[PDB]
Scaffold this motif. Structure first.
Motif, PDB file in Angstrom:
ATOM      1  N   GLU A 255       4.302  -3.131 -17.369  1.00 25.96           N
ATOM      2  CA  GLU A 255       5.697  -2.949 -17.749  1.00 25.96           C
ATOM      3  C   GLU A 255       5.844  -1.578 -18.405  1.00 25.96           C
ATOM      4  O   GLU A 255       5.017  -1.202 -19.241  1.00 25.96           O
ATOM      5  N   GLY A 256       6.835  -0.807 -17.986  1.00 24.54           N
ATOM      6  CA  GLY A 256       7.061   0.506 -18.647  1.00 24.54           C
ATOM      7  C   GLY A 256       6.084   1.609 -18.247  1.00 24.54           C
ATOM      8  O   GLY A 256       6.242   2.753 -18.705  1.00 24.54           O
ATOM      9  N   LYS A 257       5.082   1.309 -17.417  1.00 26.51           N
ATOM     10  CA  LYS A 257       4.163   2.301 -16.853  1.00 26.51           C
ATOM     11  C   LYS A 257       4.581   2.688 -15.417  1.00 26.51           C
ATOM     12  O   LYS A 257       5.310   1.954 -14.739  1.00 26.51           O
ATOM     13  N   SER A 258       4.044   3.806 -14.949  1.00 26.75           N
ATOM     14  CA  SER A 258       4.360   4.365 -13.632  1.00 26.75           C
ATOM     15  C   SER A 258       3.636   3.569 -12.531  1.00 26.75           C
ATOM     16  O   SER A 258       2.583   2.950 -12.761  1.00 26.75           O
ATOM     17  N   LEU A 259       4.204   3.567 -11.331  1.00 22.96           N
ATOM     18  CA  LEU A 259       3.452   3.029 -10.124  1.00 22.96           C
ATOM     19  C   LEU A 259       2.128   3.795  -9.922  1.00 22.96           C
ATOM     20  O   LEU A 259       1.092   3.207  -9.548  1.00 22.96           O
ATOM     21  N   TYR A 260       2.099   5.093 -10.192  1.00 20.06           N
ATOM     22  CA  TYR A 260       0.856   5.844 -10.070  1.00 20.06           C
ATOM     23  C   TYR A 260      -0.244   5.267 -10.982  1.00 20.06           C
ATOM     24  O   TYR A 260      -1.419   5.173 -10.575  1.00 20.06           O
ATOM     25  N   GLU A 261       0.115   4.909 -12.217  1.00 21.90           N
ATOM     26  CA  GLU A 261      -0.888   4.411 -13.174  1.00 21.90           C
ATOM     27  C   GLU A 261      -1.463   3.078 -12.699  1.00 21.90           C
ATOM     28  O   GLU A 261      -2.666   2.905 -12.705  1.00 21.90           O
ATOM     29  N   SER A 262      -0.596   2.150 -12.310  1.00 20.14           N
ATOM     30  CA  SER A 262      -1.053   0.842 -11.922  1.00 20.14           C
ATOM     31  C   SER A 262      -1.904   0.917 -10.633  1.00 20.14           C
ATOM     32  O   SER A 262      -2.986   0.298 -10.533  1.00 20.14           O
ATOM     33  N   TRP A 263      -1.418   1.676  -9.658  1.00 17.61           N
ATOM     34  CA  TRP A 263      -2.088   1.869  -8.383  1.00 17.61           C
ATOM     35  C   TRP A 263      -3.463   2.525  -8.582  1.00 17.61           C
ATOM     36  O   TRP A 263      -4.492   2.063  -8.052  1.00 17.61           O
ATOM     37  N   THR A 264      -3.478   3.581  -9.366  1.00 15.99           N
ATOM     38  CA  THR A 264      -4.725   4.303  -9.628  1.00 15.99           C
ATOM     39  C   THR A 264      -5.742   3.389 -10.326  1.00 15.99           C
ATOM     40  O   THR A 264      -6.928   3.357  -9.941  1.00 15.99           O
ATOM     41  N   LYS A 265      -5.250   2.639 -11.318  1.00 16.33           N
ATOM     42  CA  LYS A 265      -6.080   1.672 -11.998  1.00 16.33           C
ATOM     43  C   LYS A 265      -6.660   0.635 -11.018  1.00 16.33           C
ATOM     44  O   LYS A 265      -7.843   0.395 -11.032  1.00 16.33           O
ATOM     45  N   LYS A 266      -5.859   0.025 -10.156  1.00 22.48           N
ATOM     46  CA  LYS A 266      -6.346  -1.102  -9.362  1.00 22.48           C
ATOM     47  C   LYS A 266      -6.977  -0.653  -8.044  1.00 22.48           C
ATOM     48  O   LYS A 266      -7.654  -1.436  -7.413  1.00 22.48           O
ATOM     49  N   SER A 267      -6.724   0.582  -7.637  1.00 21.73           N
ATOM     50  CA  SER A 267      -7.260   1.090  -6.387  1.00 21.73           C
ATOM     51  C   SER A 267      -7.697   2.553  -6.571  1.00 21.73           C
ATOM     52  O   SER A 267      -7.073   3.480  -6.032  1.00 21.73           O
ATOM     53  N   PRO A 268      -8.776   2.778  -7.359  1.00 21.35           N
ATOM     54  CA  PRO A 268      -9.249   4.129  -7.614  1.00 21.35           C
ATOM     55  C   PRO A 268      -9.767   4.809  -6.340  1.00 21.35           C
ATOM     56  O   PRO A 268     -10.366   4.172  -5.470  1.00 21.35           O
ATOM     57  N   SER A 269      -9.528   6.102  -6.277  1.00 18.90           N
ATOM     58  CA  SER A 269     -10.154   6.940  -5.281  1.00 18.90           C
ATOM     59  C   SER A 269     -11.678   6.830  -5.352  1.00 18.90           C
ATOM     60  O   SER A 269     -12.247   6.834  -6.429  1.00 18.90           O
ATOM     61  N   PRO A 270     -12.342   6.756  -4.203  1.00 19.83           N
ATOM     62  CA  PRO A 270     -13.795   6.830  -4.269  1.00 19.83           C
ATOM     63  C   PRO A 270     -14.276   8.253  -4.630  1.00 19.83           C
ATOM     64  O   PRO A 270     -15.317   8.379  -5.277  1.00 19.83           O
ATOM     65  N   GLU A 271     -13.507   9.306  -4.312  1.00 21.80           N
ATOM     66  CA  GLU A 271     -13.980  10.696  -4.578  1.00 21.80           C
ATOM     67  C   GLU A 271     -13.624  11.162  -6.010  1.00 21.80           C
ATOM     68  O   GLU A 271     -14.413  11.907  -6.572  1.00 21.80           O
ATOM     69  N   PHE A 272     -12.487  10.800  -6.618  1.00 22.89           N
ATOM     70  CA  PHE A 272     -12.032  11.498  -7.852  1.00 22.89           C
ATOM     71  C   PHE A 272     -11.433  10.514  -8.859  1.00 22.89           C
ATOM     72  O   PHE A 272     -10.462   9.808  -8.573  1.00 22.89           O
ATOM     73  N   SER A 273     -12.004  10.495 -10.056  1.00 23.75           N
ATOM     74  CA  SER A 273     -11.473   9.658 -11.130  1.00 23.75           C
ATOM     75  C   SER A 273     -10.043  10.121 -11.426  1.00 23.75           C
ATOM     76  O   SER A 273      -9.736  11.316 -11.260  1.00 23.75           O
ATOM     77  N   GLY A 274      -9.178   9.190 -11.817  1.00 24.79           N
ATOM     78  CA  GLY A 274      -7.817   9.544 -12.245  1.00 24.79           C
ATOM     79  C   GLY A 274      -6.848   9.684 -11.077  1.00 24.79           C
ATOM     80  O   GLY A 274      -5.668   9.954 -11.307  1.00 24.79           O
ATOM     81  N   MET A 275      -7.331   9.455  -9.845  1.00 21.46           N
ATOM     82  CA  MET A 275      -6.475   9.433  -8.631  1.00 21.46           C
ATOM     83  C   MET A 275      -6.647   8.115  -7.875  1.00 21.46           C
ATOM     84  O   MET A 275      -7.699   7.500  -7.896  1.00 21.46           O
ATOM     85  N   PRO A 276      -5.633   7.754  -7.097  1.00 19.51           N
ATOM     86  CA  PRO A 276      -5.697   6.542  -6.317  1.00 19.51           C
ATOM     87  C   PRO A 276      -6.223   6.779  -4.900  1.00 19.51           C
ATOM     88  O   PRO A 276      -6.164   7.896  -4.382  1.00 19.51           O
ATOM     89  N   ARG A 277      -6.629   5.696  -4.275  1.00 23.42           N
ATOM     90  CA  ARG A 277      -7.113   5.748  -2.894  1.00 23.42           C
ATOM     91  C   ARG A 277      -5.936   5.919  -1.923  1.00 23.42           C
ATOM     92  O   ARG A 277      -4.998   5.156  -1.942  1.00 23.42           O
ATOM     93  N   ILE A 278      -6.035   6.917  -1.069  1.00 26.09           N
ATOM     94  CA  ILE A 278      -5.126   7.059   0.100  1.00 26.09           C
ATOM     95  C   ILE A 278      -6.005   7.160   1.348  1.00 26.09           C
ATOM     96  O   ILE A 278      -6.917   7.940   1.368  1.00 26.09           O
ATOM     97  N   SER A 279      -5.777   6.312   2.336  1.00 30.16           N
ATOM     98  CA  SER A 279      -6.646   6.196   3.498  1.00 30.16           C
ATOM     99  C   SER A 279      -6.081   7.049   4.631  1.00 30.16           C
ATOM    100  O   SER A 279      -4.886   7.390   4.631  1.00 30.16           O
ATOM    101  N   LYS A 280      -6.961   7.324   5.594  1.00 29.32           N
ATOM    102  CA  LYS A 280      -6.634   7.889   6.913  1.00 29.32           C
ATOM    103  C   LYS A 280      -5.685   6.945   7.652  1.00 29.32           C
ATOM    104  O   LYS A 280      -5.737   5.723   7.450  1.00 29.32           O
ATOM    105  N   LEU A 281      -4.823   7.504   8.499  1.00 30.41           N
ATOM    106  CA  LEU A 281      -4.115   6.684   9.413  1.00 30.41           C
ATOM    107  C   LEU A 281      -5.070   6.261  10.516  1.00 30.41           C
ATOM    108  O   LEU A 281      -5.827   7.117  10.992  1.00 30.41           O
ATOM    109  N   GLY A 282      -5.010   4.974  10.875  1.00 30.67           N
ATOM    110  CA  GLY A 282      -5.651   4.425  12.077  1.00 30.67           C
ATOM    111  C   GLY A 282      -4.617   4.346  13.185  1.00 30.67           C
ATOM    112  O   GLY A 282      -3.864   5.293  13.396  1.00 30.67           O
ATOM    113  N   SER A 283      -4.525   3.194  13.829  1.00 30.97           N
ATOM    114  CA  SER A 283      -3.492   2.945  14.769  1.00 30.97           C
ATOM    115  C   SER A 283      -3.094   1.462  14.789  1.00 30.97           C
ATOM    116  O   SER A 283      -3.287   0.785  13.808  1.00 30.97           O
ATOM    117  N   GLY A 284      -2.438   0.983  15.852  1.00 33.56           N
ATOM    118  CA  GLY A 284      -1.893  -0.359  15.816  1.00 33.56           C
ATOM    119  C   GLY A 284      -0.534  -0.453  15.135  1.00 33.56           C
ATOM    120  O   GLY A 284      -0.110  -1.531  14.652  1.00 33.56           O
TER     121      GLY A 284
END
Ligand SMILES: *[C@@H]1O[C@H](CO)[C@@H](O[C@@H]2O[C@H](CO)[C@@H](O[C@@H]3O[C@H](CO[C@H]4O[C@H](CO)[C@@H](O)[C@H](O)[C@@H]4O)[C@@H](O)[C@H](O[C@H]4O[C@H](CO)[C@@H](O)[C@H](O)[C@@H]4O)[C@@H]3O)[C@H](O)[C@H]2NC(C)=O)[C@H](O)[C@H]1NC(C)=O
Ligand SMILES: *[C@@H]1O[C@H](CO)[C@@H](O[C@@H]2O[C@H](CO)[C@@H](O[C@@H]3O[C@H](CO[C@H]4O[C@H](CO)[C@@H](O)[C@H](O)[C@@H]4O)[C@@H](O)[C@H](O[C@H]4O[C@H](CO)[C@@H](O)[C@H](O)[C@@H]4O)[C@@H]3O)[C@H](O)[C@H]2NC(C)=O)[C@H](O)[C@H]1NC(C)=O
Ligand SMILES: *[C@@H]1O[C@H](CO)[C@@H](O[C@@H]2O[C@H](CO)[C@@H](O[C@@H]3O[C@H](CO)[C@@H](O)[C@H](O)[C@@H]3O)[C@H](O)[C@H]2NC(C)=O)[C@H](O)[C@H]1NC(C)=O
Ligand SMILES: *[C@@H]1O[C@H](CO)[C@@H](O[C@@H]2O[C@H](CO)[C@@H](O[C@@H]3O[C@H](CO)[C@@H](O)[C@H](O)[C@@H]3O)[C@H](O)[C@H]2NC(C)=O)[C@H](O)[C@H]1NC(C)=O
Ligand code: FVW
Ligand code: FVW
Ligand SMILES: *[C@@H]1O[C@H](CO)[C@@H](O[C@@H]2O[C@H](CO)[C@@H](O)[C@H](O)[C@H]2NC(C)=O)[C@H](O)[C@H]1NC(C)=O
Ligand SMILES: *[C@@H]1O[C@H](CO)[C@@H](O[C@@H]2O[C@H](CO)[C@@H](O)[C@H](O)[C@H]2NC(C)=O)[C@H](O)[C@H]1NC(C)=O
Ligand SMILES: *[C@@H]1O[C@H](CO)[C@@H](O[C@@H]2O[C@H](CO)[C@@H](O)[C@H](O)[C@H]2NC(C)=O)[C@H](O)[C@H]1NC(C)=O
Ligand SMILES: *[C@@H]1O[C@H](CO)[C@@H](O[C@@H]2O[C@H](CO)[C@@H](O)[C@H](O)[C@H]2NC(C)=O)[C@H](O)[C@H]1NC(C)=O
Ligand SMILES: *[C@@H]1O[C@H](CO)[C@@H](O[C@@H]2O[C@H](CO)[C@@H](O)[C@H](O)[C@H]2NC(C)=O)[C@H](O)[C@H]1NC(C)=O
Ligand SMILES: *[C@@H]1O[C@H](CO)[C@@H](O[C@@H]2O[C@H](CO)[C@@H](O)[C@H](O)[C@H]2NC(C)=O)[C@H](O)[C@H]1NC(C)=O
Ligand SMILES: *[C@@H]1O[C@H](CO)[C@@H](O[C@@H]2O[C@H](CO)[C@@H](O)[C@H](O)[C@H]2NC(C)=O)[C@H](O)[C@H]1NC(C)=O
Ligand SMILES: *[C@@H]1O[C@H](CO)[C@@H](O[C@@H]2O[C@H](CO)[C@@H](O)[C@H](O)[C@H]2NC(C)=O)[C@H](O)[C@H]1NC(C)=O
Ligand code: NAG
Ligand code: NAG
Ligand code: CA
Ligand code: CA
Ligand code: CL
Ligand code: CL
Ligand code: ZN
Ligand code: ZN
Ligand code: ZN
Ligand code: ZN
Lengths: 695, 695
Positions: A435-464
């Motif tokens: 509550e009262g926090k940014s979507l970036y904070e919650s997303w980054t917390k629950k889905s951390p980047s494998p390469e960089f602390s303090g950032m969230p995971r963003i994946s490659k596009l596949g298809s389908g």
């Protein structure tokens, strides 16, 4: 003021709810009258919402349907030819929907007809590695066998292609509770799990971006010249049918032959998961017989195309697109996305009625026949490819808005990474405990980047999904976002009721998003991205983010190759050119970025750098396409040859290296590696050079 | 003021003369040191002329050269194996040049090595219709024969392909005085005719736009991966060699077998022009033996690229390009064009030094290895294809400035027809009897349009020069202009001394253009067109001129089809869609034109209509290319499949219709006609739609 905040605040959870309810009371199967009537309703409403123009674009494409009077089913037959067990003819309809007509029974769209009879072999997920294990390690021959595979892990179309190339004479697909039943959750209607009579529909094509099987390259318009069916693209050559786990238990429980090779081959039913071939001693003379009578038919489909004309750069197009056609009620897939698109249009339209217009043109699309192979989006893009390649800024997809309620999921081009980071920092997290926090904070917390602390995971596009034509064929920057599950705590595949009759409004409202707050957040992310793309004076793309991933991908493809050090020496296989191109791309992108930050109300310099930004994605297109896949033209990204849903980086090199140690002529195979290295290196350098000073 | 008139008046006949003399004192064969030194001289001079940047772009490409110590020749051999007649090892060098080294002897570039022995068959010009007459009408089998053909009518590469497909085991090319000796004119050095010892050099590839045989699609840069020679594009599979008419007389005079089938098969030598096979009775046991030892070698080539940066739209490129490499001295081909380019650069540079800059960027190119298959222009365009397709306004070629002294010749896209008409109305005619009249008046008078009184003839672009990659592969509006002969009064092929040692400075100065006034006029036309393309606020293209020719081409392809009325009925072959597309193109082009005439210092509307104009040529590109010719991508125009020099309109349909009555499966063949009709109709409609309002 008319800014992004006015746009975002106009979006309402309660409007999304109402639209979802409206879109999911009856089935909207591609090519049926009901989906045409929903198209006409969408067209009318987008007009009343304020868009400048809304048209239907129709095409006549190959679809597939079961025979109403000659149902598909599978049997165990005895010695005499008696059918002693028969799979279901329909899924038990959910509460209150038991009088809905026109519910298409479970089937594999585009199966050929047949009545094959034979012994069962169990092939796990029917992945490439599963067939390797069967054939090379366990010495089991699938030739002339019926194979039974569990859904999950990879696109079902790849499973069918793998079975075909192994010489199967038919394929039975089933949903294992291991992959579609989350422990501690109840079956629909009391929970969000798949019951034993539930069945996953879906097409089994291998189109590789072609669109309509009969008209590859060209729109399926009124005068189109069609291939005959024997030359059609992507159709399977053996019958295929899907079943639920009550039926599957009955087909698997009598399996004999070899034991499963390890626990990764055992699902959760009370069966041994023996590989076969055939049944154990007492039942060895019993067989399985498939009965498939579906027919392929050329059928009219309708896309809805709405236009919000740009005030300044009307010849630059930002597209928000998602499909409308559903397998049955489409409560998640696609109507949780289409409801969101409808509210985005409504919001942009209210700004428009108060006098605002976006800087660039926004196109909105309700695609048809996505479930039958991305056919609507593809034919429209074939029709309009010249416009799209010279004017298309970006494409934002809008299928399912939720597949879970844990956190955000974004897959996109590196060019939109900074856009997504910046937008999510300005949005409110809908999550409990944030509550009262940014979507970036919650997303980054629950889905951390494998390469960089303090950032969230963003994946490659596949298809389908419908972005395939725009990204992998045409080179327009593309992205997608939805709410997803925690993939850590839960080992099941997508969401359990995927492509089942049980995917309903009530599923969503009771078990996924009762307040429609996750929907609203996805609307803000998709809507926000479109707003920023259509309205920012400088296109919101960061070329430097591509430089970083290109190095990562180069390192990764080099490491695959270096599993073969002797061959790399013998054949003089160097990745030097690719690393050099990547270094150059990095350097040039950095200098471009400084010019962008530092260039005066000079609109031509601005436009010339917006054109450099817009054409950067385009630069990774090779007009000769990838080997034997002419419609996958992007050199950095393609759908995996083993799994259409997954993205592969440097796909030309990856595929030349795959299983290379089993090729008969190693000089030839390592030659093709070197060729692909050259293609990638050249294309990366060429992309870099589109960002040098122009003269 | 700094306007077109200042540009044109700065051009000097006497400067062109000096540059021609400078460029033709020694041979500049592609890949030799002397052509590299001329490249470095051009680079230095263009820099001192004022261009912003001048660079060499080098590539390593397959070239072909004779063996200095193992000369190519042809013999008549007797029963015993004695060589009783041998063709020349070199052309008698012209007066004053008898001590020049490094004159490459006559050869067919890219011939394989061989020593084939056999009987002669005479095949006239070795055209498709010539082989039809031999095989179908006269019942003569060329399989295992050596064929002798006269140069003329079609590209020599097509002759060799035709001979190959007929099963010849070698090809002898010769220059017949009927085609290379104008009556009443003397032999070089006393006139401009080909003497009996003169021989036409030239490549015999069938590249179909591919460029370097070893690297189709990609530039032949330092790390390029090369096909092996067996997979190279376009190489002939039988030995080929060219001779003069003194040698040819000796090979033809003993020919027996069938008489020529009519006078169109007889040239002007005192021989019967019997078709063969083989020699008459007394000499029947004598044979012809070829000795070919040329080698193919990967060799470095150098283009000179100069840049005049645009003041307003630096990201829009107008290109003036012509080659520098010559077979020997290159007095006409290419140096009469390159001398003209050099003076154009000098003039633009003098304006630049007084503070002027063109509105758009101008690129100047000195291409290498054009004579070996358009290799320099092609590899550069492969390298820079992303830049060229998003930024290339136009390409103006600049090979030979003269092939005669009678009138102007223009071949170009319909988009430049109004530009050419308007420019030629402002230029002075250099012609005797038209003092004080316009170039348009003299040209129109001596070369009337076949369609419209009061206009001059402008032809389709064919191929066989460096605009091929820019027009037929990439879809950039292209054109060319030179002074030409009266083709009415004279029935000879191009100019007699084409690709011979006798093409010298003195040839030009004594017999073609003693005052360099024709050169100067061609400089004004080429220079003027470049000036107008680079400087007019609205691109000087008229989309309505395309509408008119498209109707003409549609009528013409329909008339070919209507030679087969029964088949058109049986197979339901309709041209309705193509005529509909053309009508739509006409309507939309007319409405576009009104908006263009009537749209306010609004630079975005201007640019958005300059982008519509610039991308209109681009819209006729099909990324799947034509059948089995992936690098010919324009749907309206391709080089003829029977003659690379000639343009064919609606080439996909034309080729599907060609000889259709001799195909074994007529349903299949008429199906492919219908397919091509659909492709053309779709592409014309798609091109039209790029000119609708953008949103
Ligand atoms: C990343 O970006 C860098 C530029 O910062 C590129 O560097 C180029 O690298 C290529 C190699 O692929 C260099 O190629 C070499 O060019 C030499 C001549 O270059 C000079 O003169 C030319 C005129 O033709 C100018 O364009 C140029 O600016 C230089 O003044 C050749 O002589 C070299 O050939 C010789 O050596 C090689 C290798 O040992 C031999 O095989 C040859 O047979 C011959 O002996 C060579 O062709 C090029 O000069 C570099 N340009 C620069 C530094 O400006 C990278 O290529 C780029 N990465 C990718 C993947 O594109
Ligand atoms: C040259 O330009 C003209 C436009 O001025 C184009 O005209 C189009 O022609 C096509 C035929 O190729 C027409 O197609 C027909 O569309 C009908 C529906 O159109 C209406 O509704 C749609 C919504 O889907 C709107 O887009 C449209 O504006 C109309 O309101 C269909 O019902 C027709 O199908 C029926 O008849 C045919 C033929 O007998 C049957 O085969 C079908 O099975 C079905 O019964 C048909 O598909 C289209 O409407 C025209 N557009 C117009 C007039 O705006 C030309 O096509 C173009 N030339 C080329 C080569 O592109
Ligand atoms: C996402 O948000 C970030 C942070 O707001 C954006 O980066 C920032 O963008 C601005 C505008 O270009 C940069 O401002 C510049 O400051 C320097 C002075 O040090 C000067 O070069 C310029 O005159 C300009 O004012 C700012 O430096 C930059 N901050 C960074 C990189 O940390 C980013 O652009 C956004 N991404 C988008 C919109 O895609
Ligand atoms: C080649 O030269 C011709 C004749 O000069 C050019 O056509 C002319 O172009 C001008 C400018 O667009 C037209 O002027 C217009 O006049 C009408 C009023 O009747 C009005 O619509 C506009 O405000 C404008 O002033 C002129 O009509 C037109 N003449 C024609 C078509 O006969 C032609 O454009 C030139 N081609 C090039 C530059 O490629
Ligand atoms: C998590 N997951 C998914 O999201 C699959 C994508 C499902 C959905 N796409 C989808 O259903 N597309 C259709 C049509 C796809 C096509 O023909 O390319 C289908 O796959 O049958 C979407 O993009 O949301 C997944 C991965 C593997 C697997 F086996 N099952 C589900
Ligand atoms: C009149 N005429 C010509 O202008 C032929 C073009 C010659 C010249 N092109 C040229 O020599 N190109 C070279 C390379 C062509 C290539 O490889 O595509 C050649 O043809 O060998 C040019 O474009 O001016 C002609 C037509 C037919 C014929 F048999 N001989 C000459
Ligand atoms: C979904 O919403 C639409 C729009 O409100 C409903 O369609 C309207 O229905 C009313 C009452 O029948 C008609 O008078 C209008 O003509 C319709 N408007 C359209 C189509 O633009 C639709 O019936 C709702 N569907 C469900 C299942 O509730
Ligand atoms: C769907 O199945 C039915 C019935 O089992 C098919 O109808 C039969 O078709 C055959 C072959 O044309 C006829 O000889 C029979 O007389 C038909 N039977 C009935 C009950 O009508 C029907 O053709 C199939 N539909 C398809 C292939 O679309
Ligand atoms: C499985 O379905 C089949 C087909 O409906 C059943 O077998 C048929 O039964 C009828 C009535 O007994 C016979 O007259 C038909 O000849 C049979 N057809 C075939 C194709 O075998 C079968 O009974 C069902 N099995 C079970 C266990 O319910
Ligand atoms: C919607 O969100 C809730 C909150 O996490 C999910 O329910 C919980 O799931 C966790 C994780 O497996 C369990 O530990 C809890 O027992 C569940 N709690 C409650 C309150 O039910 C719920 O599953 C989510 N909906 C979907 C479809 O994923
Ligand atoms: C062609 O013209 C050029 C330029 O005037 C001559 O090259 C120059 O030669 C002088 C005298 O040898 C040198 O000092 C210069 O360095 C050269 N300048 C260059 C190359 O830019 C060239 O020699 C003339 N060629 C002929 C055959 O007359
Ligand atoms: C050009 O021709 C010469 C001479 O007739 C070739 O040189 C001979 O090559 C063969 C095979 O390699 C050797 O065995 C001889 O010893 C060489 N003879 C002489 C006189 O040197 C030469 O290789 C050819 N050049 C090529 C193919 O580029
Ligand atoms: C044609 O050229 C060939 C090759 O140079 C000549 O035949 C050669 O003559 C020498 C000297 O007499 C012999 O020793 C060689 O053995 C011959 N070589 C071959 C390949 O035959 C021939 O004399 C020349 N013919 C004429 C008429 O000049
Ligand atoms: C340059 O122009 C002149 C003028 O027409 C050409 O010479 C004449 O050619 C005509 C046409 O065949 C003959 O009737 C005359 O006898 C020639 N007159 C003179 C004065 O020589 C000349 O041929 C042209 N040059 C070239 C290479 O075509
Ligand atoms: C699999 O089965 C068939 C025999 O029925 C055979 O033609 C095929 O080659 C077999 N492959 C094996 C044993 O590897
Ligand atoms: C031409 O010659 C060879 C026989 O040497 C033969 O194989 C070929 O088919 C012949 N074609 C004919 C006679 O049409
Ligand atoms: Ca299609
Ligand atoms: Ca190449
Ligand atoms: Cl999506
Ligand atoms: Cl030319
Ligand atoms: Zn979907
Ligand atoms: Zn789906
Ligand atoms: Zn030339
Ligand atoms: Zn030439």
């Amino acid at each position: 003021k008319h800014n992004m905040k006015a746009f975002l605040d106009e979006l309402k959870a309660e409007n999304i709810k109402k639209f979802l309810y409206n879109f999911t009371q009856i089935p909207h199967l591609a090519g049926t009258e009901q989906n045409f009537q929903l198209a006409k309703q969408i067209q009318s409403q987008w007009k009343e919402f304020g868009l400048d123009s809304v048209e239907l674009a129709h095409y006549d494409v190959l679809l597939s349907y079961p025979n109403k009077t000659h149902p598909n089913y599978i049997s165990i037959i005895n010695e005499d030819g008696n059918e002693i067990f028969n799979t279901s003819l329909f899924e038990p309809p959910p509460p209150g929907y038991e009088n809905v007509s026109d519910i298409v029974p479970p089937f594999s769209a585009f199966s050929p007809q047949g009545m094959p009879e034979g012994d069962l072999v169990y092939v796990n997920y029917a992945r490439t590695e599963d067939f390797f294990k069967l054939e090379r390690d366990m010495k089991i021959n699938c030739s002339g066998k019926i194979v039974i595979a569990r859904y999950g892990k990879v696109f079902r179309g790849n499973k069918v292609k793998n079975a075909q190339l192994a010489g199967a004479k038919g394929v039975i697909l089933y949903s294992d509770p291991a992959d579609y039943f989350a422990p501690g959750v109840k079956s629909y209607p009391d929970g969000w799990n798949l019951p034993g009579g539930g069945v996953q529909r879906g097409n089994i094509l291998n189109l590789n971006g072609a669109g309509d099987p009969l008209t590859p390259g060209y729109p399926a318009n009124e005068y189109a010249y069609r291939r005959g069916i024997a030359e059609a693209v992507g159709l399977p050559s053996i019958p295929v049918h899907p079943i639920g786990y009550y039926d599957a238990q009955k087909l698997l429980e009598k399996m004999g032959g070899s034991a499963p090779p390890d626990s990764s081959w055992r699902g959760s039913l009370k069966v041994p998961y023996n590989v076969g071939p055939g049944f154990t001693g007492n039942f060895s003379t019993q067989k399985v017989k498939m009965h498939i009578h579906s027919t392929n038919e050329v059928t009219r489909i309708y896309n809805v195309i709405g236009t919000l004309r740009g005030a300044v750069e009307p010849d630059r197009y930002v597209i928000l697109g998602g499909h409308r056609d559903s397998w049955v009620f489409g409560g998640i897939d696609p109507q949780s996305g289409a409801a969101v698109v409808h509210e985005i249009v409504r919001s942009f339209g209210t700004l428009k009625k108060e006098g605002w217009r976006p800087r660039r043109t926004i196109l909105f699309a309700s695609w048809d026949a996505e479930e039958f192979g991305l056919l609507g989006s593809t034919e429209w893009a074939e029709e309009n490819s010249r416009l799209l390649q010279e004017r298309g800024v970006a494409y934002i997809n809008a299928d399912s808005s939720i597949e879970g309620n844990y956190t955000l999921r974004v897959d996109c081009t590196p060019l939109m990474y900074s856009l997504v980071h910046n937008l999510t920092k300005e949005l409110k997290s809908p999550d409990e405990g944030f509550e009262g926090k940014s979507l970036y904070e919650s997303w980054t917390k629950k889905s951390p980047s494998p390469e960089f602390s303090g950032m969230p995971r963003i994946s490659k596009l596949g298809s389908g999904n419908d972005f395939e034509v725009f990204f992998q064929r045409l080179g327009i920057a593309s992205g997608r976002a939805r709410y997803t599950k925690n993939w850590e705590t839960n080992k099941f595949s997508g969401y359990p009721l995927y492509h089942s009759v049980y995917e309903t409004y009530e599923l969503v409202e009771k078990f996924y998003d009762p307040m429609f707050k996750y929907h609203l957040t996805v609307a803000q992310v998709r809507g926000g991205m479109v707003f920023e793309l259509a309205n920012s004076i400088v296109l919101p793309f960061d070329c430097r983010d591509y430089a970083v991933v290109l190095r990562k991908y180069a390192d990764k493809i080099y490491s695959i190759s270096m599993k073969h050090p002797q061959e790399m020496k013998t054949y003089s296989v160097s990745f030097d050119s690719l690393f050099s191109a990547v270094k150059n791309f990095t350097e040039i992108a950095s200098k471009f970025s400084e010019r962008l930050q530092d260039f005066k109300s000079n609109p031509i310099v601005l436009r010339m750098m917006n054109d450099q930004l817009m054409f950067l994605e385009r630069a990774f297109i090779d007009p000769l396409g990838l080997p034997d896949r002419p419609f996958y033209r992007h050199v950095i990204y393609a759908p995996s040859s083993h799994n259409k849903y997954a993205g592969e980086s440097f796909p030309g090199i990856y595929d030349a290296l795959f299983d290379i140690e089993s090729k008969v002529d190693p000089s030839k195979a390592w030659g093709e590696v070197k060729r692909q290295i050259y293609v990638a290196a050249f294309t990366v350098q060429a992309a870099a050079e589109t960002l040098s000073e122009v003269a």
